[PDB]
Amino acid sequence: AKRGRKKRDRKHSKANHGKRPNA
Amino acid sequence: MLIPRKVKHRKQHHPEQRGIASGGTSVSFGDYGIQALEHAYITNRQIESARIAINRHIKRGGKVWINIFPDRPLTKKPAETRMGSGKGSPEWWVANVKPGRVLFELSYPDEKTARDALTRAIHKLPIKARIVTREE
Amino acid sequence: AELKITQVRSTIGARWKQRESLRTLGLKKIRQSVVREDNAQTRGLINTVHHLVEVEEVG
Amino acid sequence: ARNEIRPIVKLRSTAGTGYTYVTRKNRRNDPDRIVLRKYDPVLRRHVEFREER
Amino acid sequence: SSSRNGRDSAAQRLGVKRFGGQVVKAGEILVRQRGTHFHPGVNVGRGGDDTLFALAPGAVEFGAKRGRKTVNIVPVARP
RNA sequence: UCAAACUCCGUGAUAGCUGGUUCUCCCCGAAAUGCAUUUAGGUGCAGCGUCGCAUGUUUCUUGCCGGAGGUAGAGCUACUGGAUGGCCGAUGGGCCCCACAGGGUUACUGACGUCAGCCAAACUCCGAAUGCCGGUAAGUCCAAGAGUGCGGCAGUGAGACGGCGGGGGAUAAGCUCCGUGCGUCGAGAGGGAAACAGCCCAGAUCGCCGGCUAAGGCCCCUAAGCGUGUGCUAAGUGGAAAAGGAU
RNA sequence: UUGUGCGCCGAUAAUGUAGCGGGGCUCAAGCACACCGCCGAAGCCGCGGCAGCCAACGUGUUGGCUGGGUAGGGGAGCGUCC
RNA sequence: AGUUUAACUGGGGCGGUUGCCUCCUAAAAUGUAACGGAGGCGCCCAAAGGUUCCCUCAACCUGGACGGCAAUCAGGUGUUGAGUGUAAGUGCACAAGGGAGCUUGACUGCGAGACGGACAUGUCGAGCAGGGACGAAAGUCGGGACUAGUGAUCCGGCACCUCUGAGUGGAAGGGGUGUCGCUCAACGGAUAAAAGGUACCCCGGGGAUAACAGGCUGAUCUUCCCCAAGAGUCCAUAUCGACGGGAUGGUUUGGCACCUCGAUGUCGGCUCGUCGCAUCCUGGGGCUGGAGCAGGUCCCAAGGGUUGGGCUGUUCGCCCAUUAAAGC
RNA sequence: GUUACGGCGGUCCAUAGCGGCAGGGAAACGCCCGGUCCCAUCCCGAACCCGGAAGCUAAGCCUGCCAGCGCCGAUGAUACUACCCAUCCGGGUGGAAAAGUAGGACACCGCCGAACAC
C-alpha cells in the first residue's frame, strides 16, 4: 500500500520525467 | 431492468474509454438534460436507480428520457479460481459513455424541481456530470 | 543559401532513421558542424532530426 | 484411410489389349457395369476400358 | 470446466505480390486470392485457385474496368 | 546399515544433472525469436556473430512519381444484428352491438412505413496517417568498417522493465500473453534521480592540480543566485489522494 | 450564475519524528511567465604517448576515421621443464 | 525375470486438448501467442465433372376452387436482400445460380518462370507433342466457384516391362512403371509388440515450482463516507437509513509466483513483552422521541487497568459466577 | 461537311440512372401478316427460325424540357495520427478524413455507314 504508492509517486519527480522502472 | 433480448456475440472485449462524443452532444427530446464529462462504463442498475430518483422527486407528471441502453456486456468469472481456463460469463451489461454525451432528459415545468431532480440522479452515478438546458 | 548545422544532442535513445540520417549529413560527434545545401533532401533530414541539431543560415 | 466396405468403394479399370490400369473411386448403390469408359493406353490410343476390379 | 475453443488454421500467404510499376517475367504470380477480388485484364491469366499470373512480360497497372479492379500488363520498351 | 548384505571384478558403469576448469594483450562482437520435437530446463535447422575468399555500393537514409490495403475514425432509410421516443393503425385482441358470420368500440400489442436522435472486435456505402513493395535523383564515401553468395568456428534458443497499440483478469497486480529499423539493461561504466540493473543525459584509448556544455540545480549541509521584474499562495500548500461539501 | 490559477475539509495504523533527503523557509529558501549569469559528466575541445582499418608517398614517415564489452570467433606474445 | 506406462498446464493432480480448413483478436502488406472467442472436417459426385446453347432469382402487391402464413398459375414493382452439395470468409447478376443436348481431359509425355519458403512437405503454371470430346469456327477441357476432406519412411502384395539372372542355358529372387496394404488421430508418425502404486522409499537437481512466512494488488472482509425512497403517530437526518455510488486499512478466504528447497522449523497453550486506536471501563463533552435513575448516537482522549472456571487439541464459540470493565 | 438517323465501342463507369411533360418516322431502327422450306418449345411459330411488307410511330428507340426521386462534390475547420517537446495535463512541425455546406449534373468521346452537297 504505502510503499508501492510512494514508489509510484516518487516517479513524478523532475529528474525522471514521469517514468521509472518497476514503476 | 434494462437488458437486450439477444446479442449475437455474448462475450465482447471491454469497450474503449478514449475520445470525446460524436453524437448525443445535444439535448433532443426534453428541456433539462444531463451531460457527462469523464469516461466511464454505466450499467443497468445505476440507470434504474437514477430514473427512480427522478420519479420520486417529481412524483406526478413530467417525462423522462433515457438516451442510453446497456448493449455491451462484461464477464465476471466465478470466485477463487486461478487465472486461465477460459473467459467468464456475462453478468452485467454496460453502456460506454464518452464525455459530451447526454444521458437523461426531463420535461417538467419548474426549473427548481427539475434541476434538483437531476442533481439527485447525478449523485447515483460514478461520473462527474453537469446539467444542460436546450439553449445555446 | 547554405545551411549550417550544429549537432547538439546525442544519438543514444535514438532510432535507426535518425542515426542513419545524421550519418547521411556527415555528423558523428557532438559540436560537429556542416555546410550543407538547403534543398529538399536537406530540409527533410532536418525535419527528421530537428531535436538533435541547431540550424543556422548564412543567407 | 481404412479398408471398410465404404459407400465410395471399388477401383481398378483395366483395358482391352491395353494393359494400363487407370483408377477411380466410385459408389455402388447405383446400377451399371457394362457400358461407357475411354482413355489413352501405352503404344495404343484413345480406346475403351472396363472398370474391372 | 473446459474451453472447447482453441483451434485455428495456419496461414495461406495471400495478397498482392507484385505491385504497381514492377517488372515481371512470364508465368509470375501477381496475387494469390480466394475470390476474384482482382480480375484479369489484358495479358493476364487466372488460375484454379483464382490466383492470377502473367502471360506476357511487362509491367503492372491496377486499373478498373466497369467498377471492378483489374490487373494488366503493358509492353516494356525494348532497349 | 537390508523393499533384497558385504568384498573383489565388469568398471574409469551412466547421468538431457550440479559443481570446477589455471598466463597476457589486440580487433570485431551477440541472443533470449520461428517451425518441429516422448518435447517444453535439453536438442536439430533458419535467425543474429565472427574468420577467409568472391560481388563491388547492390544495404541504409531523404525527396519525387506509381500500387494494393479496410486499421483509428466516422456512418447507417449503404447491408447483417441491438435499440430510445413519437404518427398511423393493417394484423392481433379484451369488450360491445351479441349468431361468431358480419358491423364495430375502447389505454389495448404493435408489424410494415414514417419524423428525430444512437451503438458494435467477428456491421461497413466510406476512409486517414505511418509502415510496405518497386522505380528514379542525389547524399554518406581515406565508411557505414553496410549488403549478398559460399565454406570453417561457434554461442543463444529460461529474457526484464519503460513508451505506444491490444487480448485474459475486476478494463487489479513489480501479473500473464502478442506486436514495434522503439529504447535501455543483459554484455554499459560516469553525472542527476536522497540511497535505487532497465528512468533523463551520455556510449569510458591512457595521462594533465586546463577550458566550454547537456540532464539537473545555485539559503547552509553541497561547488554554483538568501539573482532581476510583474502578479497569486496563508494552506507549512509546497513536501500523496477520491465521490462530494462550503460566503 | 460561467470558465479559470493557486487554496480548505473529506484524510485515516501499529520499533521512533518519519508522505521536503535534513536543517530550516512565507522578512520564500514555495507556484507561474519572461530575463540574466553560473556550477556540472570519464561528453566536446586543448597539449602529449600507444594502437587497428584504409589511403597517399617513400625503402616506414605522415594524415583521416576508429579503439566499452559478457557468450564467442580471429591475431600477436611472456613464462616454466627437457 | 526384464521393461514401458506421454506432453501441455498461470505448481502438480481432476477435467479438457494435441492434426487440417474458415473468421475475429491481428494493431489498413505478409506474419504473429494465450487452457482467448465462434464453427467445421477425417466426406460426397452417370454427374453435383467437360463442352455448346438458353434463362434469371428471393421478397412484396393483386387476382385467384378446394388452398389457409405459405403449394402450382397469371400480371406488376423488383441490381440482386435468394441460391451456391457440406462450416466460414472472399467472390458470383458480365453470372461461378437455374435448365437442356452431346459426352469422359475425373487423359499420357513434359514444363519456362514464380509464390511460399528452417527442412521434408505444399500451390498455381502459359506453352510443345501424340491421341480425343464439344462446337460452325474462334477456342475451352491435365476434375469439382476457391480454400478442408487425410498420414512421411521402412516391409510386404497385384498387373506390365526388350533391366539383371552369382560357371552355361533357364528359373527363383531382386529391380523398374502404375498401384494397394495403417483412428501410427499423442496425426513431422521414439518399438510390429507394453497398464498402475509407493506414508518402505532411495539418488541427482530445482526457489525455473507449490504449502507456512515476507512482498504487490485489494475482487472479497473490516472501517468510513456520499445522495436520500421511506420507516420513525406528522417529523429524511433522536435512532435505522434502502436502490446505487466513492475511498480507506492490509487482519480474512483468495490472485501473481518476485527472495529463500547445498533446510527461513510449521496450529494452539505457557512465560515475557512492547506498539496502534478504528476505545470495554474510568475522565471531559455536544444532540435527544434526554422528566429523574438508566440510557441511545457523535467528538476529543491511550495514563492505567482490562478475572477466575466447565466442554473442545482446538483459535473462534457457548455456558456458569463475579466485575467499575470483562476491548479490537 | 450536316440533320431530331442507325451500328460497333471507350470512360479509372450513375456528372451517364429512375420517374413526369412535349415531340419525330424520307432511306434506316422497329413493331406487325403467316408457318410453305431449314430450324424450335422441358406444352405453345410466345421465344429462337423462316418466308413478306397490308397497317402504326401507340410502345421500343432518338430529341428537348423538369434538379424531383438517386448520384458527384470541393475550400476552410474538426476527429484521428507520424515525429518532438512536456513530472500526470496537455502542447508544436507536417499529413488529413467521414459527415455537412457551397454547388454540379437530364453526360462526354472515337470509328464506319446512311441520308444530304457543294
UniProtKB/Swiss-Prot annotation, chain B:
Start-end of Basic residues biased regions: 1-13
PANTHER family (alphabetical): 50S/60S RIBOSOMAL PROTEIN L16, LARGE RIBOSOMAL SUBUNIT PROTEIN UL16M
Keywords from the UniProt entry: Ribonucleoprotein, Ribosomal protein, RNA-binding, rRNA-binding, tRNA-binding
NCBIfam families reported for this sequence: rplP_bact
Pfam families in the cross-refs: Ribosomal_L16
GO biological process, one term: translation
UniProt function note: Binds 23S rRNA and is also seen to make contacts with the A and possibly P site tRNAs.
Keyword set includes Ribonucleoprotein: yes
GO MF, one annotated term: tRNA binding
Designated name of the protein: Large ribosomal subunit protein uL16
Similarity comment: Belongs to the universal ribosomal protein uL16 family.
Organism field: Mycolicibacterium smegmatis (strain ATCC 700084 / mc(2)155)
Cellular component terms (Gene Ontology): cytosolic large ribosomal subunit
Keyword Metal-binding belongs to the record: no
Swiss-Prot record, chain C:
One GO term describing the cellular component: cytosolic large ribosomal subunit
GO BP annotations listed: translation
InterPro entries given in the database record: Ribo_uL30_ferredoxin-like_sf, Ribosomal_uL30_bac-type, Ribosomal_uL30_CS, Ribosomal_uL30_ferredoxin-like
Molecular function, one GO term: structural constituent of ribosome
One family name in Pfam for this protein: Ribosomal_L30
CDD domains: Ribosomal_L30
PANTHER family: LARGE RIBOSOMAL SUBUNIT PROTEIN UL30M, MITOCHONDRIAL RIBOSOMAL PROTEIN L30
Lineage: superkingdom: Bacteria
NCBIfam families in UniProt: rpmD_bact
Subunit structure comment from the entry: Part of the 50S ribosomal subunit.
The name this protein goes by in its record: Large ribosomal subunit protein uL30
Species the sequence originates in: Mycolicibacterium smegmatis (strain ATCC 700084 / mc(2)155)
From Swiss-Prot, chain D:
Keywords: Ribonucleoprotein, Ribosomal protein
Keyword Iron-sulfur: no
Cross-referenced SUPFAM superfamilies: Zn-binding ribosomal proteins (SSF57829)
Lineage: superkingdom: Bacteria
InterPro entries membership: Ribosomal_bL33, Ribosomal_bL33_CS, Ribosomal_bL33_sf, Ribosomal_zn-bd
Gene Ontology CC terms: cytosolic large ribosomal subunit
Sample GO molecular function, one term: structural constituent of ribosome
PANTHER family: 54S RIBOSOMAL PROTEIN L39, MITOCHONDRIAL, LARGE RIBOSOMAL SUBUNIT PROTEIN BL33M
UniProt protein name: Large ribosomal subunit protein bL33B
Swiss-Prot record, chain E:
Entry keyword Repressor: no
One Pfam family this sequence matches: Ribosomal_L27
GO molecular function, one term: structural constituent of ribosome
Gene3D superfamilies in UniProt: 2.40.50.100
Keyword field: Ribonucleoprotein, Ribosomal protein
GO biological processes: translation
InterPro entries: Ribosomal_bL27, Ribosomal_bL27_CS
GO cellular component terms attached to this protein's record: cytosolic large ribosomal subunit
Keyword Ribonucleoprotein listed: yes
SUPFAM superfamilies: Ribosomal L27 protein-like (SSF110324)
Domain of life of the organism encoding this protein: Bacteria
Stated family: Belongs to the bacterial ribosomal protein bL27 family.
HAMAP family xref list: Ribosomal_bL27
Name of the protein in question: Large ribosomal subunit protein bL27
Natural source organism: Mycolicibacterium smegmatis (strain ATCC 700084 / mc(2)155)
